[PDB]
């Protein structure tokens, strides 16, 4: 009844889709063979007339080399085969091919799947978009897919958990280009867009979890922990139940500013749990810790326009109000004047779940923080520098203008960042 639709685009979108959908199948006792040995699974599934629970997700991509693994992996009986969409060839780290050449003959094929995937929902909250900004399929198909959604749904809430090009660590040379073009395309079409970088989560894996051989399957396991902690109120009881509609309202001051930060606490090894107590005050303190941010942005250079908190486990409301009061007494944290408020809160009586073979520790308190800081103008600016740096010689452009783009879409997409940059200062 409290239903959502989860979309995964590109390789990253699918590489996290394996993580999250391994979590939920575990969080509701769902065997990988569909069935299990109500109103709980109905948020992410569809109990057919006899036994089996089909997930209400859609894995969209162009390279066959990832979706076939899912078709041969253990989670192959799960997905309706028509949901897993895969093409012949990919966009090849090029925004045009994902936006003008290849994307245009598969969107409607995805829409027919999304169409029939929205009707079986009796109460819809909103779409969840997992994106990979910096590639061709994620940045190209994604932006093209959202506009087709905005004309088809318009008012519905579309969230974006868009992984973002890291400052130093980078596995691409053209990723400044297809990132800029992505934002100006999603800026007017996503309702709210969370950000997160692969490097910022690498250090989390270094300091806290103390894993020195980290891989992507060590990061995607950290993202599923966020959303499981974000959509607990949709499927689990607990005081201060909070849905998605009430999430964008008290968090997005202007129609432009919807780029936000994320955090999580605690994040500890299996053994230091036997060295700690994890009081609720300690958690929310470490939640505001810049070192616990999932983006390589520094909040201590800017001010907070809003905050959102999702607690979980053994938490009672007096201490949330007691400890938040303390953080508002601290001075390292600032708030822009025109929001004396700023703390939407949430509780859940279902502690986070642990995965066999995972790296987290069994705990009973946790916090997933989401904030809209004005310091997010710094990570924004570098993309405007490297774009402007390469665009002066117009290197690599003969590829974009070779696949159905012209010079307009470059300056067009470049000014909006300038317009958005001043917007991040007009609020000060």
């Amino acid at each position: 009844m409290r239903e959502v639709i989860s979309i995964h685009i590109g390789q990253a979108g699918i590489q996290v889709g394996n993580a999250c959908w391994e979590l939920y199948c575990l969080e509701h006792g769902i065997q990988p063979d569909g069935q299990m040995p109500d109103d709980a699974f109905n948020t992410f599934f569809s109990e057919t007339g006899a036994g089996k629970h089909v997930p209400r997700c859609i894995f969209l991509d162009l390279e066959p080399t990832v979706v076939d693994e899912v078709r041969t992996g253990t989670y192959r009986q799960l997905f309706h085969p028509e949901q897993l969409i895969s093409g012949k060839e990919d966009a090849a780290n090029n925004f045009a091919r994902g936006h003008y050449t290849i994307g245009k003959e598969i969107v409607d094929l995805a829409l027919d799947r999304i169409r029939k995937l929205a009707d079986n929902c009796t109460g819809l909250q909103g779409f969840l978009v997992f994106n990979a900004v910096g590639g061709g399929t994620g940045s190209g198909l994604g932006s093209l897919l959202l506009e087709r959604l905005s004309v088809d749904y318009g008012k519905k809430s579309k969230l974006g958990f868009t992984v973002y090009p890291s400052p130093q660590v980078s596995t691409a040379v053209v990723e400044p280009y297809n990132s800029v073009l992505s934002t100006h395309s999603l800026l007017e079409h996503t309702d709210v867009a969370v950000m997160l970088d692969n490097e910022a989560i690498y250090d989390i894996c270094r300091r806290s979890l103390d894993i020195e051989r980290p891989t992507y399957t060590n990061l995607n396991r950290l993202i599923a922990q966020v959303i499981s902690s974000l959509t607990a109120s949709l499927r689990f009881d607990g005081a201060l139940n909070v849905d998605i509609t009430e999430f964008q309202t008290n968090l997005v001051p202007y129609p432009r500013i919807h780029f936000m930060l994320s955090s999580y606490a605690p994040i500890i090894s299996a053994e230091k749990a036997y060295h700690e107590q994890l009081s609720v005050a300690e958690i929310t303190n470490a939640a505001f810790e810049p070192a616990s941010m999932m983006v390589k942005c520094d909040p201590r250079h800017g001010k907070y326009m809003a905050c959102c908190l999702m607690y979980r486990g053994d938490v009672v409301p007096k201490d949330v109000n007691a400890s938040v009061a303390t953080i508002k007494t601290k001075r390292t944290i600032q708030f822009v004047d025109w929001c004396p408020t700023g703390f939407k809160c949430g509780i859940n009586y279902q502690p986070p779940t642990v995965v066999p073979g995972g790296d987290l520790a069994k705990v009973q308190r946790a916090v997933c923080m989401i904030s809209n800081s004005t310091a997010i103008g710094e990570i924004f600016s570098r993309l405007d520098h490297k774009f402007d740096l390469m665009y002066a010689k117009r290197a690599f452009v003969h590829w974009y203008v070779g696949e159905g783009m012209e010079e307009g879409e470059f300056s067009e997409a470049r000014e909006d960042l300038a317009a958005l940059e001043k917007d991040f200062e007009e609020v000060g």
Binding site: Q11, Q15, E63, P64, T65, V66, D68, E69, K88, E89, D90, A91, A92, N93, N94, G136, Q168, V169, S170, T171, A172, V173, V174, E175, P176, Y202, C205, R213, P214, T215, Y216, T217, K386, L389, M390, A392, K393, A395, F396, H398, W399
Partner: protein, 428 residues
């Protein structure tokens, strides 16, 4: 999906093509009989990138062997892995080529071309979604340079969308197999600039050093060098054929590499390479690989990158490994030795990885880098050309085939504008 088709033009092309197919056939575990006798299902998954099913479960290569002087097509037919090719895909000519670019490109080429294009289309339609062509040339002789580029200047008009490589073996500055060698080079370069998307340059000299310094080999035979070339050609398509936590199709590797449509002359290097003595002292770690590949010794072309400035680079790793370690390593390189890298390209590396190593190893790597030191090659050949061309030495051979003298100046100046593009873009 992502079908390739492989050309082998000339004695070299027909002699290193033997080794290339003796590497892949072993990698997919198919006996010299052709029948598949491998172990896993990972072989049969993406076999269709290089082969075609036949009755009784036998796979034949989608190769094309063109060469004058049929005295080589008995060798491949008598080699161990020779009984796997189709007897049709053997386009030879009873006439010799005479180490003359003219007759290989003007008379004897011109009648074999259509007899080759009848073949290439018979296996350009056999593909589901063609990825692109790839060739193995040798810019010294007449078969590989005359019929080679002439075949390219035909492929380009029937398949311009697709993507054609070039593993061109170039002439050597100190070693001179033949005397006319400078002419057959320049007149062939003037073809690659307009009808090739990518072109790696290989020289027998760096092939001789790596065979003497690293491998410490006593008698480097030609059948041993081609074990190096065939090692890197198989190292490109590892993403096409096997899963990987960061896969990279062949197309996305070109756009991230050539900023402008002309600077498609690359530089390769394979790792790890070690004698049978130092297999006792070596550790199989990622910092070992990335140290050996960035060295100025693995550069299979005899140009020293410490004289130029890397525009971009690449790395194709194989073997279950950590995807952060491979990113922080390549991150350090740009920061320590920050002079050999250009300024108007902020992040000028790309890094892929595949879960499946070579058959006999556990970890490997592969390097591609588009440097500006590559102009030292095109300087050398342009000194010997303008030396003997100034006096019309050995010219009556070329003009007897209907050629003229402008065909030389064009091909020469078209090397001069090219040798300055690499210079003006190299701002120290």
């Amino acid at each position: 999906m992502r079908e390739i088709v492989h050309i082998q033009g000339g004695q070299c092309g027909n002699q290193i093509g033997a080794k290339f197919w003796e590497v892949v056939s072993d990698e997919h575990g198919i006996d010299p009989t052709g029948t598949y006798h491998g172990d896993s299902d990972l072989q049969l998954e993406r076999i269709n990138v290089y082969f075609n099913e036949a009755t009784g479960g036998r796979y034949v290569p989608r190769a094309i062997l063109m060469d004058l002087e049929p005295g080589t097509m008995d060798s491949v037919r008598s080699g161990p892995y020779g009984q796997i090719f189709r007897p049709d895909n053997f386009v030879f000519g009873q006439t010799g080529a005479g180490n003359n670019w003219a007759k290989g490109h003007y008379t004897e080429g011109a009648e074999l071309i259509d007899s080759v294009l009848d073949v290439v289309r018979k296996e350009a339609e056999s593909c589901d979604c063609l990825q692109g062509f790839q060739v193995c040339h040798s810019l010294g002789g007449g078969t590989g340079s005359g019929m080679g580029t002439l075949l390219i200047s035909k492929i380009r008009e029937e398949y311009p969308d697709r993507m054609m490589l070039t593993f061109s073996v170039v002439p050597s500055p100190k070693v001179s197999d033949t005397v006319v060698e400078p002419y057959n080079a320049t007149l062939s370069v003037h073809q690659l600039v307009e009808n090739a998307d990518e072109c790696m340059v290989l020289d027998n000299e760096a092939l001789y050093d790596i065979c003497f310094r690293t491998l410490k080999l006593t008698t480097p035979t030609f059948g041993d060098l081609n074990h190096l070339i065939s090692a890197v050609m198989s190292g490109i398509t590892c993403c096409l054929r096997f899963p990987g936590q960061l896969n990279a199709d062949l197309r996305k590797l070109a756009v991230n590499l050539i900023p402008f449509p002309r600077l498609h002359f690359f530089m390769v290097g394979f790792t790890p390479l070690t004698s049978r003595g130092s297999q006792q002292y070596r550790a199989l770690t990622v910092p070992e690989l990335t140290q050996q590949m960035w060295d100025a010794k693995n550069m299979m072309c005899a140009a020293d990158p410490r004289h130029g400035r890397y525009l971009t680079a690449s790395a194709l790793f194989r073997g279950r490994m950590s995807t952060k370690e491979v990113d922080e390593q390549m991150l350090n390189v740009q920061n320590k030795n920050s002079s050999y890298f250009v300024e108007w390209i902020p992040n000028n590396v790309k890094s892929s990885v595949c879960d499946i190593p070579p058959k006999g190893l556990k970890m490997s790597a592969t390097f591609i880098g588009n440097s500006t030191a590559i102009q030292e090659m095109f300087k050398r050949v342009s000194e010997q050309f303008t030396a003997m061309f100034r006096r019309k030495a050995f010219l009556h051979w070329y003009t007897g085939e209907g050629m003229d003298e402008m065909e030389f100046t064009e091909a020469e100046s078209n090397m001069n504008d090219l040798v300055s593009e690499y210079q003006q873009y190299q701002d120290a």
